[PDB]
Amino acid sequence: EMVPFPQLPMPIENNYRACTIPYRFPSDDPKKATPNEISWINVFANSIPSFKKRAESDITVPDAPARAEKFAERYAGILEDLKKDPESHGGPPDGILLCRLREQVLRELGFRDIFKKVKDEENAKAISLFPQVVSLSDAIEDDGKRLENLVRGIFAGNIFMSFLASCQNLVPRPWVIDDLENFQAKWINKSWKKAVIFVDNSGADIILGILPFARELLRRGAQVVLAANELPSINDITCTELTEILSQLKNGQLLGVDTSKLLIANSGNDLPVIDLSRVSQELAYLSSDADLVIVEGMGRGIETNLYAQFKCDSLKIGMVKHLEVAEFLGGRLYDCVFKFNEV
Ligand SMILES: [Mg+2]
Ligand SMILES: [Mg+2]
């Protein structure tokens, strides 16, 4: 069904490991949860109160409040099961498993897109600000000087008073991982012609952060494929919704820019993170000849893939939102990593 992302050097077996942070070593007692596993499940246990809300007030679901209880209950129970016996529920657990257990408790209860009214108002407001945000970047005559603006916009699209305000108030540089200089150097040579991008959140993150960036690439001579979730996971943008967003934005041009090279792909993903060894077949066909891959969101670029090796130039970009992630990286909360690996 799923196939390995084409830019992952083969063989991927015993080499590519999606997860970025290990919570257990082979030498650890298999019947006792490790301090780390224990502390990481807390990141997921502390996600419930906020998930049981977007679910209980989901008016599209009949008797949502009761069902949200079944959610909090079943998910907390599973989390306790793992702390007591890390081998059950498919453990040892990693970030991917914990995310999947959350989506499963919810879906089994009949949920498909519990983040609907949110994503709607998200794109709702973002759509009313695209021309303003785009015009600016264009007003920036220098290409590299401009590249930075868009790169900061990607980071601002994360947490977000306004998107533009948030764009000028990121944590000070050097950023946790700061490969921007090396990236800007190659960007000015403009040698990329096949970019693919694994997007994350709806609204400003996709509309004001990623799309203006994608538009600049097209304006410099590249094809761009945006890979989005097949199924709703948090406020993440799915391929279906992204097609609707661009359909509205687009002479089929994005504020004067031709989009014939703007392609949308269904990564086949259904989590806020992603395992690149297993994706849709469509995604790979479209990314079969890519020379610029990009995985956005703390999940897709840092929790997973941060150290993934690719056959072509690579860049993981996302804002750090977990204190635990900041700790593993030795960074600040809301730090921005810009990791670029040439060749
Ligand atoms: Mg997200
Ligand atoms: Mg996560």
mmCIF file of C-alpha atoms and ligand atoms in Angstrom:
data_model
loop_
_atom_site.group_PDB
_atom_site.id
_atom_site.type_symbol
_atom_site.label_atom_id
_atom_site.label_comp_id
_atom_site.label_asym_id
_atom_site.label_seq_id
_atom_site.Cartn_x
_atom_site.Cartn_y
_atom_site.Cartn_z
ATOM 1 C CA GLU A 1 0.000 0.000 0.000
ATOM 2 C CA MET A 2 2.494 2.606 1.238
ATOM 3 C CA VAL A 3 5.959 3.058 -0.264
ATOM 4 C CA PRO A 4 9.217 4.719 0.934
ATOM 5 C CA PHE A 5 9.581 8.433 0.163
ATOM 6 C CA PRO A 6 11.831 8.452 -2.972
ATOM 7 C CA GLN A 7 14.435 10.810 -1.536
ATOM 8 C CA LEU A 8 15.304 8.454 1.337
ATOM 9 C CA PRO A 9 18.575 6.639 0.423
ATOM 10 C CA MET A 10 18.087 2.866 0.175
ATOM 11 C CA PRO A 11 18.118 0.592 2.072
ATOM 12 C CA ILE A 12 16.027 2.363 4.720
ATOM 13 C CA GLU A 13 15.768 -0.725 6.932
ATOM 14 C CA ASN A 14 17.779 -0.454 10.151
ATOM 15 C CA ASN A 15 18.817 3.031 9.001
ATOM 16 C CA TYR A 16 15.871 5.426 8.745
ATOM 17 C CA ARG A 17 14.075 5.734 12.093
ATOM 18 C CA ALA A 18 11.264 8.293 11.953
ATOM 19 C CA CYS A 19 11.361 9.242 15.648
ATOM 20 C CA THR A 20 13.887 11.825 16.779
ATOM 21 C CA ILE A 21 14.042 11.336 20.525
ATOM 22 C CA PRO A 22 14.587 7.849 22.016
ATOM 23 C CA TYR A 23 13.004 7.199 25.429
ATOM 24 C CA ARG A 24 14.464 3.698 25.817
ATOM 25 C CA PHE A 25 17.681 1.755 25.148
ATOM 26 C CA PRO A 26 17.872 -2.058 24.651
ATOM 27 C CA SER A 27 19.622 -2.349 28.030
ATOM 28 C CA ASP A 28 16.609 -0.983 29.911
ATOM 29 C CA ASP A 29 14.307 -3.322 31.854
ATOM 30 C CA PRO A 30 11.499 -4.165 29.412
ATOM 31 C CA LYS A 31 8.868 -4.457 32.177
ATOM 32 C CA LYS A 32 9.404 -1.020 33.766
ATOM 33 C CA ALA A 33 8.665 2.346 32.139
ATOM 34 C CA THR A 34 11.749 4.568 31.797
ATOM 35 C CA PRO A 35 11.856 8.080 33.333
ATOM 36 C CA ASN A 36 11.729 9.455 29.799
ATOM 37 C CA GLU A 37 8.811 7.354 28.555
ATOM 38 C CA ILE A 38 7.038 8.369 31.761
ATOM 39 C CA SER A 39 7.712 12.061 31.175
ATOM 40 C CA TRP A 40 6.804 11.860 27.496
ATOM 41 C CA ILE A 41 3.461 10.211 28.101
ATOM 42 C CA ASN A 42 2.768 13.266 30.320
ATOM 43 C CA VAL A 43 3.075 15.354 27.125
ATOM 44 C CA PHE A 44 0.229 13.230 25.795
ATOM 45 C CA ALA A 45 -1.685 13.031 29.087
ATOM 46 C CA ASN A 46 -1.565 16.830 29.247
ATOM 47 C CA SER A 47 -3.066 16.915 25.742
ATOM 48 C CA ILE A 48 -6.369 15.382 26.854
ATOM 49 C CA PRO A 49 -8.046 18.283 28.723
ATOM 50 C CA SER A 50 -7.564 20.368 25.542
ATOM 51 C CA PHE A 51 -8.683 17.579 23.188
ATOM 52 C CA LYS A 52 -11.718 16.627 25.298
ATOM 53 C CA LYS A 53 -12.822 20.214 24.638
ATOM 54 C CA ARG A 54 -12.582 20.435 20.850
ATOM 55 C CA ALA A 55 -14.446 17.111 20.929
ATOM 56 C CA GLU A 56 -17.142 17.718 23.546
ATOM 57 C CA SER A 57 -18.232 20.959 21.919
ATOM 58 C CA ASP A 58 -18.190 19.344 18.473
ATOM 59 C CA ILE A 59 -21.850 20.049 17.703
ATOM 60 C CA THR A 60 -21.698 17.943 14.541
ATOM 61 C CA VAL A 61 -21.483 14.912 16.805
ATOM 62 C CA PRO A 62 -24.675 13.989 18.665
ATOM 63 C CA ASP A 63 -24.179 13.701 22.428
ATOM 64 C CA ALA A 64 -20.613 14.987 22.015
ATOM 65 C CA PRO A 65 -20.084 15.791 25.730
ATOM 66 C CA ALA A 66 -20.660 12.169 26.797
ATOM 67 C CA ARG A 67 -18.471 10.806 24.005
ATOM 68 C CA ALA A 68 -15.664 13.217 24.938
ATOM 69 C CA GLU A 69 -15.688 11.572 28.363
ATOM 70 C CA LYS A 70 -15.227 8.176 26.710
ATOM 71 C CA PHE A 71 -12.290 9.798 24.914
ATOM 72 C CA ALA A 72 -10.530 11.227 27.958
ATOM 73 C CA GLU A 73 -11.252 7.977 29.804
ATOM 74 C CA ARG A 74 -10.001 5.513 27.179
ATOM 75 C CA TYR A 75 -6.955 7.598 26.289
ATOM 76 C CA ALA A 76 -5.882 8.168 29.908
ATOM 77 C CA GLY A 77 -6.352 4.473 30.602
ATOM 78 C CA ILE A 78 -4.119 3.478 27.674
ATOM 79 C CA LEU A 79 -1.503 5.956 28.875
ATOM 80 C CA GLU A 80 -1.618 4.311 32.317
ATOM 81 C CA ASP A 81 -1.387 0.874 30.674
ATOM 82 C CA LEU A 82 1.868 1.961 28.985
ATOM 83 C CA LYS A 83 3.395 3.330 32.211
ATOM 84 C CA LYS A 84 2.656 -0.056 33.853
ATOM 85 C CA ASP A 85 3.601 -2.323 30.935
ATOM 86 C CA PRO A 86 5.475 -0.533 28.113
ATOM 87 C CA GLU A 87 5.143 -3.688 26.014
ATOM 88 C CA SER A 88 1.369 -3.521 25.548
ATOM 89 C CA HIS A 89 -0.562 -1.471 23.001
ATOM 90 C CA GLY A 90 2.285 -2.089 20.561
ATOM 91 C CA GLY A 91 5.070 -0.690 22.710
ATOM 92 C CA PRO A 92 7.826 0.200 23.568
ATOM 93 C CA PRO A 93 6.169 3.497 22.790
ATOM 94 C CA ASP A 94 7.530 6.259 20.608
ATOM 95 C CA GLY A 95 5.985 9.545 19.530
ATOM 96 C CA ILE A 96 4.242 7.977 16.561
ATOM 97 C CA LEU A 97 2.446 5.369 18.687
ATOM 98 C CA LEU A 98 1.291 7.891 21.281
ATOM 99 C CA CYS A 99 -0.104 10.155 18.551
ATOM 100 C CA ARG A 100 -1.877 7.251 16.893
ATOM 101 C CA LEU A 101 -3.490 6.097 20.139
ATOM 102 C CA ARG A 102 -4.956 9.588 20.543
ATOM 103 C CA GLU A 103 -6.435 9.626 17.040
ATOM 104 C CA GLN A 104 -7.781 6.115 17.540
ATOM 105 C CA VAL A 105 -9.644 6.723 20.778
ATOM 106 C CA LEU A 106 -11.316 9.702 19.094
ATOM 107 C CA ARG A 107 -12.103 8.100 15.727
ATOM 108 C CA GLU A 108 -13.512 4.931 17.260
ATOM 109 C CA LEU A 109 -15.983 7.247 18.990
ATOM 110 C CA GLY A 110 -17.055 8.498 15.566
ATOM 111 C CA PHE A 111 -14.868 11.569 15.083
ATOM 112 C CA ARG A 112 -13.322 12.406 11.701
ATOM 113 C CA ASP A 113 -12.406 16.104 11.855
ATOM 114 C CA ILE A 114 -12.792 17.407 15.395
ATOM 115 C CA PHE A 115 -10.830 20.464 14.363
ATOM 116 C CA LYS A 116 -13.353 21.854 11.914
ATOM 117 C CA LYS A 117 -14.750 25.131 13.181
ATOM 118 C CA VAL A 118 -11.173 26.006 14.186
ATOM 119 C CA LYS A 119 -9.626 25.274 10.769
ATOM 120 C CA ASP A 120 -12.519 27.149 9.163
ATOM 121 C CA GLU A 121 -12.057 30.341 11.133
ATOM 122 C CA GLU A 122 -8.315 29.838 10.732
ATOM 123 C CA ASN A 123 -8.335 29.916 6.966
ATOM 124 C CA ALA A 124 -11.199 32.405 7.431
ATOM 125 C CA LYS A 125 -8.945 35.048 8.938
ATOM 126 C CA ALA A 126 -5.830 34.070 7.028
ATOM 127 C CA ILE A 127 -7.637 34.364 3.700
ATOM 128 C CA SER A 128 -8.517 37.969 4.608
ATOM 129 C CA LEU A 129 -4.816 38.764 4.957
ATOM 130 C CA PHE A 130 -3.064 36.963 2.116
ATOM 131 C CA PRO A 131 -2.791 39.888 -0.347
ATOM 132 C CA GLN A 132 -1.338 42.178 2.334
ATOM 133 C CA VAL A 133 1.255 39.640 3.448
ATOM 134 C CA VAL A 134 2.147 38.723 -0.131
ATOM 135 C CA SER A 135 2.444 42.318 -1.423
ATOM 136 C CA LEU A 136 5.046 43.081 1.225
ATOM 137 C CA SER A 137 7.447 40.261 0.330
ATOM 138 C CA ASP A 138 7.192 41.402 -3.267
ATOM 139 C CA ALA A 139 7.983 44.977 -2.209
ATOM 140 C CA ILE A 140 11.289 43.557 -0.961
ATOM 141 C CA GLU A 141 13.559 44.119 -3.953
ATOM 142 C CA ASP A 142 16.518 42.031 -2.793
ATOM 143 C CA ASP A 143 15.963 38.302 -3.233
ATOM 144 C CA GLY A 144 17.982 37.105 -0.240
ATOM 145 C CA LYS A 145 16.815 39.950 1.965
ATOM 146 C CA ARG A 146 13.341 38.777 0.934
ATOM 147 C CA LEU A 147 14.064 35.085 1.522
ATOM 148 C CA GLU A 148 14.564 35.883 5.178
ATOM 149 C CA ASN A 149 11.210 37.669 5.390
ATOM 150 C CA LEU A 150 9.413 34.565 4.039
ATOM 151 C CA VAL A 151 11.485 32.254 6.257
ATOM 152 C CA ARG A 152 10.450 34.311 9.307
ATOM 153 C CA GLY A 153 6.872 34.119 8.025
ATOM 154 C CA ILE A 154 7.063 30.316 8.071
ATOM 155 C CA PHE A 155 8.073 30.445 11.724
ATOM 156 C CA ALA A 156 5.349 33.002 12.505
ATOM 157 C CA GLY A 157 2.758 30.859 10.752
ATOM 158 C CA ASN A 158 3.423 28.371 13.604
ATOM 159 C CA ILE A 159 2.353 29.991 16.902
ATOM 160 C CA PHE A 160 0.147 32.536 15.103
ATOM 161 C CA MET A 161 -1.163 41.109 18.029
ATOM 162 C CA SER A 162 -1.151 39.573 14.536
ATOM 163 C CA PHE A 163 0.686 37.248 12.160
ATOM 164 C CA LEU A 164 2.726 40.188 10.864
ATOM 165 C CA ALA A 165 3.520 41.295 14.421
ATOM 166 C CA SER A 166 4.467 37.728 15.375
ATOM 167 C CA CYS A 167 6.751 37.734 12.315
ATOM 168 C CA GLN A 168 9.030 40.346 13.876
ATOM 169 C CA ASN A 169 9.107 38.905 17.379
ATOM 170 C CA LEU A 170 10.762 35.480 17.090
ATOM 171 C CA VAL A 171 13.356 34.358 19.629
ATOM 172 C CA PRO A 172 16.753 35.998 18.912
ATOM 173 C CA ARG A 173 19.354 34.408 16.647
ATOM 174 C CA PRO A 174 21.395 32.296 16.495
ATOM 175 C CA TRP A 175 18.318 30.063 16.381
ATOM 176 C CA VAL A 176 18.624 26.574 17.964
ATOM 177 C CA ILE A 177 19.640 25.179 14.558
ATOM 178 C CA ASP A 178 20.535 28.033 12.220
ATOM 179 C CA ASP A 179 21.557 27.027 8.692
ATOM 180 C CA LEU A 180 19.923 30.057 7.064
ATOM 181 C CA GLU A 181 23.187 31.610 5.835
ATOM 182 C CA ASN A 182 24.221 28.418 4.055
ATOM 183 C CA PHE A 183 20.734 28.091 2.602
ATOM 184 C CA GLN A 184 20.461 31.669 1.384
ATOM 185 C CA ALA A 185 23.818 31.246 -0.342
ATOM 186 C CA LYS A 186 22.491 28.402 -2.505
ATOM 187 C CA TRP A 187 19.081 30.036 -2.915
ATOM 188 C CA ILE A 188 20.750 32.914 -4.781
ATOM 189 C CA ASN A 189 22.221 30.415 -7.268
ATOM 190 C CA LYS A 190 18.667 29.146 -7.851
ATOM 191 C CA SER A 191 19.447 25.554 -8.796
ATOM 192 C CA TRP A 192 16.308 23.842 -7.406
ATOM 193 C CA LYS A 193 13.516 22.862 -9.781
ATOM 194 C CA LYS A 194 11.516 20.248 -7.864
ATOM 195 C CA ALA A 195 10.331 21.202 -4.335
ATOM 196 C CA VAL A 196 7.912 19.139 -2.230
ATOM 197 C CA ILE A 197 6.544 20.408 1.112
ATOM 198 C CA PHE A 198 4.910 18.477 3.961
ATOM 199 C CA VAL A 199 2.645 21.113 5.479
ATOM 200 C CA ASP A 200 1.278 21.167 9.016
ATOM 201 C CA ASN A 201 -1.295 23.619 10.345
ATOM 202 C CA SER A 202 -4.225 25.242 8.599
ATOM 203 C CA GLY A 203 -4.863 28.968 8.562
ATOM 204 C CA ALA A 204 -1.933 31.406 8.753
ATOM 205 C CA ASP A 205 0.667 28.685 8.915
ATOM 206 C CA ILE A 206 -0.364 27.329 5.510
ATOM 207 C CA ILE A 207 -1.914 30.499 3.996
ATOM 208 C CA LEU A 208 0.416 33.265 5.171
ATOM 209 C CA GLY A 209 3.567 31.310 5.932
ATOM 210 C CA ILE A 210 3.931 28.479 3.419
ATOM 211 C CA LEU A 211 1.977 29.732 0.413
ATOM 212 C CA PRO A 212 3.856 33.031 0.066
ATOM 213 C CA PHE A 213 7.097 31.034 0.330
ATOM 214 C CA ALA A 214 5.877 28.544 -2.291
ATOM 215 C CA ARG A 215 4.980 31.510 -4.515
ATOM 216 C CA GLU A 216 8.506 32.924 -4.268
ATOM 217 C CA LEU A 217 9.969 29.552 -5.368
ATOM 218 C CA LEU A 218 7.642 29.497 -8.373
ATOM 219 C CA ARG A 219 8.674 33.076 -9.119
ATOM 220 C CA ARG A 220 12.309 31.936 -9.177
ATOM 221 C CA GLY A 221 11.825 28.929 -11.443
ATOM 222 C CA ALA A 222 10.736 25.860 -9.472
ATOM 223 C CA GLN A 223 7.911 23.286 -9.395
ATOM 224 C CA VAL A 224 6.272 22.956 -5.943
ATOM 225 C CA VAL A 225 4.340 20.000 -4.535
ATOM 226 C CA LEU A 226 2.483 20.545 -1.232
ATOM 227 C CA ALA A 227 1.945 17.255 0.627
ATOM 228 C CA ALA A 228 -0.902 17.277 3.142
ATOM 229 C CA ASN A 229 -2.623 14.837 5.510
ATOM 230 C CA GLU A 230 -5.201 12.499 4.097
ATOM 231 C CA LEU A 231 -7.170 12.570 7.354
ATOM 232 C CA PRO A 232 -7.779 15.335 9.900
ATOM 233 C CA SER A 233 -5.299 15.312 12.798
ATOM 234 C CA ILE A 234 -5.400 18.337 15.147
ATOM 235 C CA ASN A 235 -5.650 21.580 13.131
ATOM 236 C CA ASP A 236 -3.379 20.162 10.456
ATOM 237 C CA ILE A 237 -4.271 20.924 6.853
ATOM 238 C CA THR A 238 -5.432 17.949 4.741
ATOM 239 C CA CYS A 239 -5.042 17.676 0.983
ATOM 240 C CA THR A 240 -8.805 18.072 0.569
ATOM 241 C CA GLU A 241 -8.940 21.392 2.417
ATOM 242 C CA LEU A 242 -5.758 22.723 0.779
ATOM 243 C CA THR A 243 -7.283 22.153 -2.641
ATOM 244 C CA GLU A 244 -10.252 24.275 -1.544
ATOM 245 C CA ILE A 245 -7.938 26.994 -0.164
ATOM 246 C CA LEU A 246 -5.870 27.336 -3.356
ATOM 247 C CA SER A 247 -9.025 27.080 -5.469
ATOM 248 C CA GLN A 248 -10.167 30.272 -3.744
ATOM 249 C CA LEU A 249 -6.782 31.991 -3.837
ATOM 250 C CA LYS A 250 -6.195 31.434 -7.579
ATOM 251 C CA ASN A 251 -5.979 33.616 -14.512
ATOM 252 C CA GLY A 252 -5.411 30.828 -12.020
ATOM 253 C CA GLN A 253 -2.583 32.969 -10.698
ATOM 254 C CA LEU A 254 -1.635 33.652 -7.087
ATOM 255 C CA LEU A 255 -1.565 37.444 -6.985
ATOM 256 C CA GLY A 256 -0.013 37.616 -10.424
ATOM 257 C CA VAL A 257 1.991 34.386 -10.241
ATOM 258 C CA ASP A 258 1.318 31.368 -12.450
ATOM 259 C CA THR A 259 0.426 28.184 -10.556
ATOM 260 C CA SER A 260 0.698 25.621 -13.361
ATOM 261 C CA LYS A 261 3.689 24.227 -11.439
ATOM 262 C CA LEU A 262 1.908 24.278 -8.058
ATOM 263 C CA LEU A 263 0.949 20.666 -7.302
ATOM 264 C CA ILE A 264 -0.938 19.282 -4.271
ATOM 265 C CA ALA A 265 -0.297 15.745 -2.971
ATOM 266 C CA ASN A 266 -2.008 13.423 -0.467
ATOM 267 C CA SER A 267 0.841 12.115 1.707
ATOM 268 C CA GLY A 268 -1.517 9.428 2.933
ATOM 269 C CA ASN A 269 -0.599 10.635 6.435
ATOM 270 C CA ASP A 270 -3.143 10.703 9.259
ATOM 271 C CA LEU A 271 -1.091 11.991 12.202
ATOM 272 C CA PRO A 272 0.396 15.390 13.157
ATOM 273 C CA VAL A 273 3.804 13.727 12.825
ATOM 274 C CA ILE A 274 4.775 11.356 10.004
ATOM 275 C CA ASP A 275 6.636 8.141 9.163
ATOM 276 C CA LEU A 276 8.358 8.768 5.790
ATOM 277 C CA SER A 277 9.102 5.094 5.126
ATOM 278 C CA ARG A 278 5.356 4.576 4.583
ATOM 279 C CA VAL A 279 3.363 7.041 2.481
ATOM 280 C CA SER A 280 0.821 7.143 -0.333
ATOM 281 C CA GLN A 281 1.833 6.034 -3.803
ATOM 282 C CA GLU A 282 0.521 9.287 -5.262
ATOM 283 C CA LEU A 283 2.817 11.321 -3.052
ATOM 284 C CA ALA A 284 5.901 9.451 -4.279
ATOM 285 C CA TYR A 285 4.936 9.676 -7.959
ATOM 286 C CA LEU A 286 4.783 13.450 -7.548
ATOM 287 C CA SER A 287 7.967 13.544 -5.492
ATOM 288 C CA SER A 288 9.682 10.855 -7.547
ATOM 289 C CA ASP A 289 11.982 13.482 -9.069
ATOM 290 C CA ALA A 290 12.282 16.022 -6.239
ATOM 291 C CA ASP A 291 15.476 17.919 -5.419
ATOM 292 C CA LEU A 292 13.962 19.950 -2.517
ATOM 293 C CA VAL A 293 11.916 18.311 0.239
ATOM 294 C CA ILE A 294 10.425 20.216 3.223
ATOM 295 C CA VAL A 295 8.557 18.796 6.268
ATOM 296 C CA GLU A 296 6.826 21.572 8.255
ATOM 297 C CA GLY A 297 5.542 21.547 11.852
ATOM 298 C CA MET A 298 7.235 20.569 15.107
ATOM 299 C CA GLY A 299 6.048 17.027 14.483
ATOM 300 C CA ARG A 300 7.215 16.460 10.880
ATOM 301 C CA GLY A 301 10.558 18.288 11.051
ATOM 302 C CA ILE A 302 11.816 17.983 14.626
ATOM 303 C CA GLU A 303 9.971 15.195 16.534
ATOM 304 C CA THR A 304 10.398 13.214 13.338
ATOM 305 C CA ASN A 305 12.915 13.500 10.505
ATOM 306 C CA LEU A 306 15.162 16.159 12.062
ATOM 307 C CA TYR A 307 18.156 13.907 11.381
ATOM 308 C CA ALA A 308 16.689 12.065 8.378
ATOM 309 C CA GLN A 309 19.125 11.623 5.510
ATOM 310 C CA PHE A 310 18.000 12.499 1.995
ATOM 311 C CA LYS A 311 19.395 11.951 -1.530
ATOM 312 C CA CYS A 312 18.814 15.641 -2.317
ATOM 313 C CA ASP A 313 19.331 18.883 -0.408
ATOM 314 C CA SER A 314 17.217 19.016 2.728
ATOM 315 C CA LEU A 315 15.750 21.531 5.181
ATOM 316 C CA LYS A 316 13.571 20.902 8.270
ATOM 317 C CA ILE A 317 11.827 24.022 9.530
ATOM 318 C CA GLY A 318 9.539 24.459 12.512
ATOM 319 C CA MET A 319 8.923 26.264 15.782
ATOM 320 C CA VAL A 320 9.611 24.370 19.046
ATOM 321 C CA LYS A 321 6.380 24.186 21.078
ATOM 322 C CA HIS A 322 7.121 21.451 23.657
ATOM 323 C CA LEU A 323 9.323 22.308 26.628
ATOM 324 C CA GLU A 324 10.484 18.680 26.317
ATOM 325 C CA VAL A 325 11.513 19.199 22.703
ATOM 326 C CA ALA A 326 13.391 22.354 23.698
ATOM 327 C CA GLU A 327 15.169 20.340 26.385
ATOM 328 C CA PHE A 328 16.283 17.555 24.019
ATOM 329 C CA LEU A 329 17.624 20.284 21.688
ATOM 330 C CA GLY A 330 19.015 22.557 24.396
ATOM 331 C CA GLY A 331 16.862 25.369 23.049
ATOM 332 C CA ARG A 332 14.247 27.911 24.159
ATOM 333 C CA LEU A 333 10.484 27.455 24.099
ATOM 334 C CA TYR A 334 9.335 28.909 20.736
ATOM 335 C CA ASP A 335 12.846 28.623 19.309
ATOM 336 C CA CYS A 336 13.064 28.268 15.533
ATOM 337 C CA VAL A 337 15.211 25.594 13.995
ATOM 338 C CA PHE A 338 16.330 26.018 10.396
ATOM 339 C CA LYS A 339 18.315 22.894 9.596
ATOM 340 C CA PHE A 340 19.665 22.723 6.071
ATOM 341 C CA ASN A 341 21.786 19.891 4.685
ATOM 342 C CA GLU A 342 23.201 20.426 1.196
ATOM 343 C CA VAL A 343 23.790 17.336 -0.956
HETATM 344 MG MG MG B 1 -0.026 20.861 13.414
HETATM 345 MG MG MG B 2 2.686 15.871 18.583
#
